[PDB]
Amino acid sequence: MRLCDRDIEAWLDEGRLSINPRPPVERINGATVDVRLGNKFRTFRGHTAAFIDLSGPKDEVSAALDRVMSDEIVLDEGEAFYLHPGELALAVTLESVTLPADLVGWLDGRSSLARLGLMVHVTAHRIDPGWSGCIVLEFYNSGKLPLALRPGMLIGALSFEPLSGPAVRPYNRREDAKYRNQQGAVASRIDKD
Amino acid sequence: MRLCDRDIEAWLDEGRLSINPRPPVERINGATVDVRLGNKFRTFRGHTAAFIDLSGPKDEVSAALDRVMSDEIVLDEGEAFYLHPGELALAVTLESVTLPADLVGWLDGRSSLARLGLMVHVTAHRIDPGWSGCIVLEFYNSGKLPLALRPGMLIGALSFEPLSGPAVRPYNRREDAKYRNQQGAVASRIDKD
Amino acid sequence: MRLCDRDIEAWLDEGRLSINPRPPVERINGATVDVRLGNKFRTFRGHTAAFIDLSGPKDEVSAALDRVMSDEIVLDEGEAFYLHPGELALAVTLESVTLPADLVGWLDGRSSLARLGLMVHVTAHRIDPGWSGCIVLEFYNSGKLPLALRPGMLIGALSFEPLSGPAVRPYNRREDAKYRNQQGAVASRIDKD
Numbered sequence: 001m002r003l004c005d006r007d008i009e010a011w012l013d014e015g016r017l018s019i020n021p022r023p024p025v026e027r028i029n030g031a032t033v034d035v036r037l038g039n040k041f042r043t044f045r046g047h048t049a050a051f052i053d054l055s056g057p058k059d060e061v062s063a064a065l066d067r068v069m070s071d072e073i074v075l076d077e078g079e080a081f082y083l084h085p086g087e088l089a090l091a092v093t094l095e096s097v098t099l100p101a102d103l104v105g106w107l108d109g110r111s112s113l114a115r116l117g118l119m120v121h122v123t124a125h126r127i128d129p130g131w132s133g134c135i136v137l138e139f140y141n142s143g144k145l146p147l148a149l150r151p152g153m154l155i156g157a158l159s160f161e162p163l164s165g166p167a168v169r170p171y172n173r174r175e176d177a178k179y180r181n182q183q184g185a186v187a188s189r190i191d192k193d
Numbered sequence: 194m195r196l197c198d199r200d201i202e203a204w205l206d207e208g209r210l211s212i213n214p215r216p217p218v219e220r221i222n223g224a225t226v227d228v229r230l231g232n233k234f235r236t237f238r239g240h241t242a243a244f245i246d247l248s249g250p251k252d253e254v255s256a257a258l259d260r261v262m263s264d265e266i267v268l269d270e271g272e273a274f275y276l277h278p279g280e281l282a283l284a285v286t287l288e289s290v291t292l293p294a295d296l297v298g299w300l301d302g303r304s305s306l307a308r309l310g311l312m313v314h315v316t317a318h319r320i321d322p323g324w325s326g327c328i329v330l331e332f333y334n335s336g337k338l339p340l341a342l343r344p345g346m347l348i349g350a351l352s353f354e355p356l357s358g359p360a361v362r363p364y365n366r367r368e369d370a371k372y373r374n375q376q377g378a379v380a381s382r383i384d385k386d
Numbered sequence: 387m388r389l390c391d392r393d394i395e396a397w398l399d400e401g402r403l404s405i406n407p408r409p410p411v412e413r414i415n416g417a418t419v420d421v422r423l424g425n426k427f428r429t430f431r432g433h434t435a436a437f438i439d440l441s442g443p444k445d446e447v448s449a450a451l452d453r454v455m456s457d458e459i460v461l462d463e464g465e466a467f468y469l470h471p472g473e474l475a476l477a478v479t480l481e482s483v484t485l486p487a488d489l490v491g492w493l494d495g496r497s498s499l500a501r502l503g504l505m506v507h508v509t510a511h512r513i514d515p516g517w518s519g520c521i522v523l524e525f526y527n528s529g530k531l532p533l534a535l536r537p538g539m540l541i542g543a544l545s546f547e548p549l550s551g552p553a554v555r556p557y558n559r560r561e562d563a564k565y566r567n568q569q570g571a572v573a574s575r576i577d578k579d
């Protein structure tokens with residue numbers, strides 16, 4: 001059961017669900033709230049490494065991720081991020097989202113974006129109960145034309161689903177959770193497994 | 194919570210949602226209804242433009258969009274659409290779908306298709322409350338062989354999820370809604386933001 | 387709704403839902419169960435065929451399917467599968483999963499993976515009521531680095547949604563279902579349509 005727009009407004013009103021800054025009524029409809037693009041981005045630099053060993057020694061994985069991730073890219077005013085066909089980039093939503101333990105959220109892209117080849121995630125769009133933070137985005141342009149992305153644009157949408165009950169281990173209270181306190185285009189923390 | 198098959202036929206019989214034409218009992222099972230491929234397609238014309246500035250001057254973007262998008266392709270019966278690896282294309286389902294204000298629909302591809310690298314949407318699969326119209330698809334071949342696509346083939350599935358209540362701003366009533374009355378392989382209307 | 391972590395535990399304890407080997411409490415949290423990578427893979431031998439005609443003479447298709455799919459790749463103790471950028475491969479979960487008739491399953495990748503461009507499915511992540519088998523994965527590396535994938539790594543997560551009622555045609559009973567008894571990296575059976 002997804003929350004319809006009126007119920008999202010009420011959960012936002014009771015305050016155990018928070019989205020900061022809260023999108024206006026124009027941006028809450030049907031069963032979704034729209035989200036916008038922030039100004040933090042990351043690209044990859046392959047020429048430093050042959051591969052990343054997802055399960056190799058923790059220490060060596062940490063080194064690798066550091067050699068292939070650029071530092072965080074912040075665009076100056078009026079500047080766009082040019083997302084080219086075939087070139088994965090990280091970003092973040094403008095909004096920070098905080099979910100109570102009895103709710104899960106799901107991120108969609110936008111049909112208007114899909115129709116130009118823009119994926120907003122890479123088969124990982126689940127915002128967990130306990131989640132608090134901005135939501136990281138994995139952009140892939142599967143299209144034929146580069147796309148200029150500007151901070152501020154409508155980039156995705158969130159739907160919300162009350163759970164059968166309060167999660168007994170929500171994200172915020174879980175010791176090996178990787179991304180609590182998320183805020184920019186944070187790179188993979190696969191080396192934490 | 195999704196409608197089981199029996200309830201889907203029950204909502205169909207009582208007119209609480211429509212699928213036109215209505216798939217036979219063979220294509221309604223578990224918690225889904227299969228949909229079939231339409232015969233309208235669109236490709237992209239990269240050479241005519243450098244890039245698309247998703248949230249730039251409306252006239253610019255609008256014009257760019259009209260430059261890079263093919264006219265609508267209608268297959269002469271028997272004809273195939275050859276979807277090559279690397280080549281995004283727009284299409285549409287055979288079926289028209291109409292959803293009430295208290296239900297959201299979700300498009301799936303097919304495992305049989307996935308195992309050949311065919312994506313049927315680019316992170317945009319939500320069919321909104323109040324929606325009425327044929328569903329546009331975004332085909333991307335991530336695999337290693339060209340795939341011949343013909344009208345009338347089984348291309349995906351829809352599952353339906355009642356909302357916590359009736360949406361106050363459902364799609365058919367939102368005035369900045371982009372794709373109401375969509376009945377073909379309609380291009381992105383991202384300029385309309 | 388989806389089952390909160392407790393309730394997942396309830397259904398495993400009750401027993402109509404089953405996951406073998408049952409993941410420890412630690413890999414069950416929020417609204418999901420974590421699933422792990424199996425040791426069976428398949429690749430594509432493109433040079434043996436010009437294309438696959440998704441809805442051509444059954445004959446034609448199976449042979450072409452047979453010609454393009456590799457012999458299963460079985461990784462033995464301490465081995466890696468190198469998934470290079472742009473090279474679709476088939477794989478499977480470690481876990482076998484059985485869903486009762488009144489439950490639907492949904493596969494997600496992992497954010498940690500997503501941020502290095504690994505998709506774990508190609509728009510086909512629904513696990514059907516009546517399903518009993520290992521879950522096949524469709525890996526696509528959309529990033530810029532090769533990724534070493536080792537059997538037993540955390541590769542994804544499942545969440546569960548109870549249905550409005552028991553499906554009248556669940557997977558295990560549906561005569562034309564293609565993938566029951568799935569115990570490895572099973573190729574597309576689009577020719578059985």
Ligand SMILES: O=c1ccn([C@H]2C[C@H](O)[C@@H](COP(=O)(O)OP(=O)(O)OP(=O)(O)O)O2)c(=O)[nH]1
Pocket residue numbers: 108109110111112113300314317318319320321322324327328329330364369370371372375
């Ligand atoms: O796979 C899909 C998904 C969506 N749509 C339709 C159904 C949905 O109700 C609508 C709007 O979807 P979305 O909000 O993702 O697209 P948008 O680009 O944001 O358009 P709008 O500004 O109208 O929200 O487009 C399709 O035709 N095919």
Ligand SMILES: O=c1ccn([C@H]2C[C@H](O)[C@@H](COP(=O)(O)OP(=O)(O)OP(=O)(O)O)O2)c(=O)[nH]1
Pocket residue numbers: 302303304305306493507510511512513514515517520521522523557562563564565568
């Ligand atoms: O990530 C997934 C998703 C699905 N499947 C399995 C589960 C599901 O119940 C079954 C059928 O899926 P679907 O209906 O999408 O595929 P199909 O190609 O239409 O096969 P069928 O004719 O069996 O419906 O395949 C997997 O192995 N992995």
Ligand SMILES: O=c1ccn([C@H]2C[C@H](O)[C@@H](COP(=O)(O)OP(=O)(O)OP(=O)(O)O)O2)c(=O)[nH]1
Pocket residue numbers: 107121124125126127128129131134135136137171176177178179182495496497498499
């Ligand atoms: O599109 C998304 C999806 C998820 N996340 C966040 C929300 C979520 O609750 C968290 C963890 O997601 P997941 O469990 O898929 O990733 P992980 O790689 O397994 O990390 P962890 O070890 O923390 O579970 O990351 C995002 O920032 N953007």
Ligand SMILES: [Mg+2]
Pocket residue numbers: 110157
């Ligand atoms: Mg929208």
Ligand SMILES: [Mg+2]
Pocket residue numbers: 303304
């Ligand atoms: Mg199916």
Ligand SMILES: [Mg+2]
Pocket residue numbers: 496543
């Ligand atoms: Mg996780």
